[PDB]
Paper text:
We were also unsuccessful in our attempt to obtain an FAD‐bound structure of the Ftp_EcE169K protein variant (this residue is analogous to the active‐site residue K165 in Ftp_Tp), but once again obtained a structure that was determined at a higher resolution than wild‐type (1.75 vs. 1.88 Å) with a similarly improved final Rfree parameter. There are four monomers in the asymmetric unit of each crystal structure, and the r.m.s.d. of the monomers within each structure ranges from 0.5 to 1.6 Å and 0.3 to 1.6 Å, respectively, between the two structures for approximately 300 Cα carbons. John Wiley & Sons, LtdIn the site previously denoted in the Ftp_Tp structure as metal binding site 1, a single metal ion is bound in the wild‐type and Ftp_EcE169K protein variant structures. Aided by the high resolution of our structural data, two water molecules were observed bound to each metal ion and thus the coordination number for the metal is seven, consistent with a Ca2+ rather than a Mg2+ ion as observed in the Ftp_Tp structures. Thus, in agreement with the original structure determination, we have assigned these as Ca2+ ions. Superposition of three representative Ftp_Ec monomers illustrates the inherent flexibility of the loop region near the active site comprising residues 237–253.
We recently reported a flavin‐trafficking protein (Ftp) in the syphilis spirochete Treponema pallidum (Ftp_Tp) as the first bacterial metal‐dependent FAD pyrophosphatase that hydrolyzes FAD into AMP and FMN in the periplasm. Orthologs of Ftp_Tp in other bacteria (formerly ApbE) appear to lack this hydrolytic activity; rather, they flavinylate the redox subunit, NqrC, via their metal‐dependent FMN transferase activity. In the current study, we identified a bimetal center in the crystal structure of Escherichia coli Ftp (Ftp_Ec) and show via mutagenesis that a single amino acid substitution converts it from an FAD‐binding protein to a Mg2+‐dependent FAD pyrophosphatase (Ftp_Tp‐like). A high‐resolution structure of the Ftp‐mediated flavinylated protein of Shewanella oneidensis NqrC identified an essential lysine in phosphoester‐threonyl‐FMN bond formation in the posttranslationally modified flavoproteins.
Residue numbers in the entry:
A (entry chain C): 13 to 115, 120 to 216, 223 to 329
B (entry chain A): 12 to 119, 122 to 213, 223 to 244, 247 to 328
C-alpha cells in the first residue's frame, strides 16, 4: 500500500511522519495535530523561550517542589539516570559551564572560572517527585540551570509516536531532527528504512524502539592534531579532545537514545565502550584514526541490522 | 521456513512462554536459564506472596519517610499511579486491604458491613503514595503507615517488557514473549509471518507492541454469584456486565495497567476513558446468556 509523508519545522530542526496512505482531509487534520503538539513540546522544553515551563523553573529561586507536567518529570528522570550511568558525561545542569565558552574557542575561561562555574552545576542537585495526579521538580541550589536540548528531540519523537497510536496509526516512522521512533512494518510488510552513516550502507529495523545520533563524519572539525569541538565535557568543563566522530544509539525509546548518544559522545571511544558493555547498549561508533574512519558496533546493535 | 523453539516455565503464580525462531539447543538452554533467573528476580522484587520481597519489606515498614527502591519499582509505581488517576481511581494498587476484607484474594470470610468497608477504605487510596527519583537513587514514600501496595495487576506486563529487554541484551530480534496474558510481539515467526495473537478466534498483529487481558470469571461460564473484582471506590464487588478487557499498547506494562482499570470501570465509563486517551481496546460483556463485543477504532487497526 502507499505511504503519506508529513513534514514540518520544530525545535530548530525538521520533523517527519511517514504513515500508511491517508486521504487529504485526514492528512491536513493530522498535520495540524502534529504541529500543535510539537509547538507545545517546544514551548514546554525550550531555553530560548523565556516563558517556557523549563525557563520558568530556571528563573525561580525556590528550593521547594515545583509543579511540572508528566513529560517534564519523565524527561528529567531519564536524564538523571543516564547521567549517572555515563559518570556524569550526560549532564542537563552543565549550561553555566557551556556559557563560559560561547558554545575553535574565541573566548576561553581560566581554570578558576571553570571551577567556580562547576560549583553551580551537578546532577545531584535535582529531584523528581511523582504522584498520582501531579508531579514536581525540586532543586537544592537556587541558580541551578537546566537545559534539555540534548534530550528534547528524542522525547518529541516518542511523543509524536504516541500521538500516532492515539490516532489509530500503529505503523509508522516518525522523526524529530536525528531522533526517530518506529513501530509496525511499512506498506509492503517490511521494516521502515532507517539508514546508518557509512563513512567510506548499513540499514536497521528499529521496530518498537527509538534511535538517535550525535555527531557526523561530515561535521568533524579538526585542526593540526587536535579535535575542535563545542561539546563541553561537564567533568573537565572543557571541550572534548578525543576522536569519536559520531555515535548512534538504539534504545527502547528515542528519549533514552538521545540521552545516551550525548553522554557517549562526551566520554569518547574507550570510556563509551565500557559503558556500552556494562549497560548492554546497542551502539554504532565512527572514529577518526589517521587518514581513515573506523566503525564499530556492539553485539546488541548488530542484532538490529537488516539484510 | 525455520523452526520456532518454545520455552515455558512458572512465574508469579502463572506461566511464561518465549517463542524464538532459528535458535539451537545450546542457546535455548542458556536462554531458558537466563529467562527463569530474571523472572525469579522480578517475582522477588514484586510479590506480595513472598514475605521478604522488596515490596513486602516496604509494606511491613511503618515508615513515613522515603524508602529506597529499584529503578523498576519506581517506574512501575509511577505508571500505576498515573493510570490510576486517568481511570478515576479504578486502577488502584493500594486496594489490597479491601480485597482481603472480602477474602477475595486467590489464596484465601464473612461478608463485611458497609461501615467496616468504609473504615478499611481509610487504609487505601492513590493519594497516599509518592515516587522520588534522583541521579543514583529512587524511593517510594507513603504518608500512611499501614498502606499496603500490591502490584499483581501490573507485574505481568512489567515482566513481559523486561523479557523483551533481555531478548535484546541477548541479540534476539524476533520473538513472542508472554507472562500470563501479557505479551510482546516482535518480528516474523518461523514462516516469515507476524506472530499469531488470538483473542477469544479474532486475530491481531501486534508486531512492535504489547497486549494484556484482564477479566471477571466468577460468572463467565454461567449470574449466580458476585464478582471477586472489588471496585476501589465503593469497596464492593463490581455490578456491571463487562467480563473481559484486552488492551494493546506500546508496552505490555501500560496494557496491563489499563486493562484492570477499564475492567473495574465497566462498559460506559471505560469507553469514555478509551475515547479520551485514544486506547486500543477490546471489550467483552455478558448481558444474560448472550455475549457482546466492542472494539475501539485503534484496536481495529491491529486486526488481520
Ligand atoms: Ca542527544
Ligand atoms: Ca492488569
Ligand atoms: Na558542582
Ligand atoms: Na481512603
Amino acid at each position: 500500500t502507499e505511504v503519506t509523508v508529513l513534514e514540518g519545522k520544530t525545535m530548530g530542526t525538521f520533523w517527519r511522519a511517514s504513515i500508511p496512505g491517508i486521504d487529504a482531509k485526514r492528512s491536513a487534520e493530522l498535520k495540524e495535530k502534529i504541529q500543535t503538539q510539537l509547538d507545545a513540546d517546544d514551548q514546554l522544553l525550550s531555553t530560548y523561550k523565556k516563558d517556557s515551563a523549563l525557563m520558568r523553573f530556571n528563573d525561580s529561586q525556590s528550593l521547594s517542589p515545583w509543579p511540572v507536567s508528566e513529560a517534564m518529570a519523565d524527561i528529567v528522570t531519564t536524564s538523571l539516570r543516564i547521567g549517572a550511568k555515563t559518570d556524569g558525561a550526560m549532564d542537563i545542569t552543565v549550561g553555566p559551564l557551556v556559557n563560559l565558552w560561547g558554545f575553535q574557542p574565541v573566548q576561553i575561561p581560566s581554570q578558576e572560572q571553570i571551577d567556580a562555574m562547576k560549583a553551580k552545576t551537578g546532577l545531584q542537585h535535582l529531584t523528581v517527585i511523582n504522584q498520582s495526579h501531579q508531579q514536581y521538580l525540586q532543586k537544592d541550589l537556587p541558580d541551578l540551570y537546566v537545559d534539555l536540548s540534548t534530550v528534547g528531540k528524542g522525547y518529541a519523537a516518542d511523543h509524536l509516536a504516541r500521538l500516532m497510536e492515539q490516532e489509530g496509526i500503529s505503523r509508522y516512522l516518525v522523526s524529530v531532527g536525528g531522533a526517530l521512533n518506529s513501530r509496525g512494518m511499512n506498506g509492503e510488510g517490511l521494516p521502515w528504512r532507517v539508514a546508518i552513516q557509512k563513512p567510506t550502507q548499513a540499514v536497521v529495523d528499529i521496530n518498537g524502539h527509538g534511535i538517535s545520533t550525535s555527531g557526523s563524519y561530515r561535521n568533524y572539525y579538526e585542526l593540526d592534531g587536535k579535535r575542535l569541538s563545542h561539546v563541553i565535557d561537564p567533568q573537565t568543563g572543557r571541550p572534548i579532545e578525543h576522536n569519536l566522530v559520531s555515535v548512534t544509539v538504539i534504545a527502547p525509546t528515542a528519549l533514552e537514545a538521545d540521552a545516551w548518544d550525548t553522554g557517549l559522545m562526551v566520554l569518547g571511544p574507550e570510556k563509551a565502550k565500557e559503558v556500552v558493555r556494562r549497560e548492554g547498549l546497542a551502539v554504532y561508533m565512527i572514529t577518526k584514526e589517521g587518514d581513515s574512519f573506523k566503525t564499530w558496533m556492539s553485539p546488541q546493535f548488530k542484532s538490529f541490522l537488516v539484510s
